[PDB]
Amino acid sequence: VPGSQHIDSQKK
Amino acid sequence: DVLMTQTPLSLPVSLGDQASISCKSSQSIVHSSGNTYFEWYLQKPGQSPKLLIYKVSNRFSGVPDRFSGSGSGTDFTLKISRVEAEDLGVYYCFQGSHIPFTFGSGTKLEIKRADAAPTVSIFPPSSEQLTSGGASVVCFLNNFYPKDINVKWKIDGSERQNGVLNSWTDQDSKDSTYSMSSTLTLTKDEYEWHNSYTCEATHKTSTSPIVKSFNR
Amino acid sequence: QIQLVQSGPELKTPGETVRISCKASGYTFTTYGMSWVKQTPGKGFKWMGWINTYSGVPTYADDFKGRFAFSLETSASTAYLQINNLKNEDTATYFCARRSWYFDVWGTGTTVTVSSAKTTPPSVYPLAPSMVTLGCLVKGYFPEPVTVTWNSGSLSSGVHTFPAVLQSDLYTLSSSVTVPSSPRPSETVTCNVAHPASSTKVDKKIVPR
Numbered sequence: 001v002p003g004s005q006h007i008d009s010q011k012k
Numbered sequence: 013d014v015l016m017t018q019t020p021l022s023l024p025v026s027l028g029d030q031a032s033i034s035c036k037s038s039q040s041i042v043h044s045s046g047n048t049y050f051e052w053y054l055q056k057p058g059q060s061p062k063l064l065i066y067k068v069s070n071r072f073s074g075v076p077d078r079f080s081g082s083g084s085g086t087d088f089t090l091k092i093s094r095v096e097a098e099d100l101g102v103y104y105c106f107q108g109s110h111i112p113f114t115f116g117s118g119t120k121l122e123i124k125r126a127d128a129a130p131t132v133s134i135f136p137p138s139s140e141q142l143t144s145g146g147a148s149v150v151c152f153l154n155n156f157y158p159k160d161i162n163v164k165w166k167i168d169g170s171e172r173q174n175g176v177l178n179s180w181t182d183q184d185s186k187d188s189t190y191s192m193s194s195t196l197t198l199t200k201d202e203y204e205w206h207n208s209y210t211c212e213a214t215h216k217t218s219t220s221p222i223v224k225s226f227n228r
Numbered sequence: 229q230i231q232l233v234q235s236g237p238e239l240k241t242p243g244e245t246v247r248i249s250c251k252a253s254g255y256t257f258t259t260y261g262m263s264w265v266k267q268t269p270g271k272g273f274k275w276m277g278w279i280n281t282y283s284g285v286p287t288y289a290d291d292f293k294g295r296f297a298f299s300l301e302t303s304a305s306t307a308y309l310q311i312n313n314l315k316n317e318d319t320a321t322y323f324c325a326r327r328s329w330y331f332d333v334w335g336t337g338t339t340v341t342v343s344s345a346k347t348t349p350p351s352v353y354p355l356a357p358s359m360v361t362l363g364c365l366v367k368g369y370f371p372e373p374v375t376v377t378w379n380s381g382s383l384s385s386g387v388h389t390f391p392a393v394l395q396s397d398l399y400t401l402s403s404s405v406t407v408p409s410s411p412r413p414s415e416t417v418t419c420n421v422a423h424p425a426s427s428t429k430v431d432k433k434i435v436p437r
Contacts, residue, residue: 002049002108003278003287005261006328011046051330060323060337066330104273108327112289113263113275133404135355135363136437150355150365152404154388179390179401193390193402195365 014039014107018116026124027188031092033119035105040085042109049108052081052090053115056101057182064103065090097123100185122159125188129217130156134210134224137203147203149196151211151224155189158216163194166210172196204228230254232324232335239371239425240342244314248338250307250324257305258282263325264298264309267337278327279307314342341371345397349426350374354419356437359386361406364419364432368398374423376403383407383417 001008015038025031042048050068053061063072065081068088078093092099100123105116130153137147153161159180165172175198181191194211206228213222235249250262263278277288279298286298297310307324321339325331348370355363366374376389386406392399407417413436422429 001047001329002043002111003113003261003263004327004329005259005280005282008045008047008329049329053331060334061325061331063330063332072330072332106331108330111287115273115275117272131361131406133357133361135357135365138353138355138365139437140351141353141365141367144351148353148365148367150363150402152361152363152388152402154361154404154406177393177395177400179393181388181390191388191390193404195400195402 013112014041014110014114016105016107016114016116018105018119020119021117022120022122024122024124025095027095027097029095031095031121032089033103034083034087034089035116036088037086037107039110041107042085047109048085050081050083050088051106051108052079053104053106054099054101055104056185059101061104062101092121095121095123097188098185099123100183100188122183123188125157127217128155128157128189130154130161130192130213130215130222132211132213132222132224134226136226136228142200142203145200147198147200149198149209149211151194152191153194153211153213153222154191155184155187156191156215156217157189159183159190160216161192162214163192164212164214164221165194165196166208166212167196167206168208230326230333232326232333234322234324234335234338237339237341237373237424239347240314240340241344242314242316242342244342245310245312246314246340248309248311248322248324248340250309250335252305252307252326255326257302260326260328262298262307263327263331264296264307265323265325266320267323268320276309276322281307311340314340316342318342339373343371345370347371347425348398349428350421350423350430352419352421352430352432354432354434355402355404356434358409359406360409360412361404362412362417362419362434363402363404364421364434365400365402366421367400368396369400369423369426370398371425372399374399374401374421376401377420378403378405379416379418380420 324335350369
């Protein structure tokens with residue numbers, strides 16, 4: 001996640 | 013960079029009514045992952061930005077369901093259904109998908125309200141300012157709506173419009189009014205050559221001018 | 229709760245150095261990345277870059293590489309922004325912002341005014357005459373800000389301070405308070421004006437003229 005230290009899932 | 017153009021720049025809207033604000037990006041803000049880190053912030057006068065919506069349409073915690081967001085790729089919209097007086101502020105979109113992160117120039121929400129005649133008071137210069145050879149006469153025209161109000165100073169019957177400085181508060185958040193101050197600064201020399209000073213307000217809530225005076 | 233408190237307004241001459249602290253309380257500092265964003269009076273917000281509070285590694289945006297340093301004190305839960313060889317063009321409010329999938333918490337904000345103009349204390353003038361409106365006219369100061377209160381802040385209602393107008397190199401602003409008639413003058417109304425840049429605080433009691 002640009003600018004963040006957090007994670008997120010990708011989107012097919 | 014991704015240019016973010018926002019429309020409107022000002023959006024007067026009635027209480028109870030709906031409002032949309034749109035933002036267009038100059039290239040797609042879909043992150044390579046497929047997610048779109050797109051957000052709406054509100055900033056009130058004298059306050060830090062407030063998170064309304066992230067990831068195009070998700071309301072943050074404790075945000076009222078009247079607020080909702082939409083759009084894809086390059087075009088997005090925030091809708092406030094039922095505008096309340098408290099939504100006063102400036103709305104800004106932000107994209108956080110491509111570095112550098114960019115914001116929209118902002119949209120100012122103005123609330124159309126029922127009308128209110130101003131309360132007007134004028135003040136003589138103070139002894140302290142006359143001891144400095146300066147004489148400012150101040151007029152307050154507080155809590156009116158609409159914001160269009162024409163103020164004219166008169167000195168012994170004749171208008172003067174040099175040495176006049178007006179200042180307007182932001183629109184009040186609880187009762188939605190505007191207030192204004194108008195100062196006439198004169199040099200004391202010119203002040204002591206005259207007798208009556210008149211602050212007069214033209215506002216659609218009145219058919220008369222609202223006039224306040226005093227005499228030296 | 230969660231707070232990001234920032235240092236106060238700084239007035240600087242061009243060529244000077246400022247450091248702006250961002251102290252985070254209420255959450256573990258090393259788990260959210262910190263951004264710094266500039267809000268220019270009128271021209272809107274630019275993001276300046278961010279610093280990963282875990283790795284200590286900073287990312288500057290192209291128009292802020294050079295004179296800008298983000299640093300950290302993690303035992304103190306504080307982020308710092310350093311701006312060297314301060315240009316005029318750096319007068320803005322700066323914000324630290326915590327980011328996870330969004331900036332949910334934004335710092336209080338620190339205004340920096342860079343200016344070779346000289347700090348000038350206000351002349352404050354009392355404006356004396358159901359409800360009565362009283363005033364204080366504050367004239368000829370530089371720079372901004374100036375804080376006006378009425379009875380050291382215990383008289384909050386009925387108050388209005390109009391934005392400062394610039395005319396010459398100097399600012400002027402008015403503040404007004406409406407109180408019940410059977411109160412003034414029985415119950416004293418005093419205007420208090422603190423101008424941080426000149427380290428001055430004046431208190432003016434409105435008396436019947």
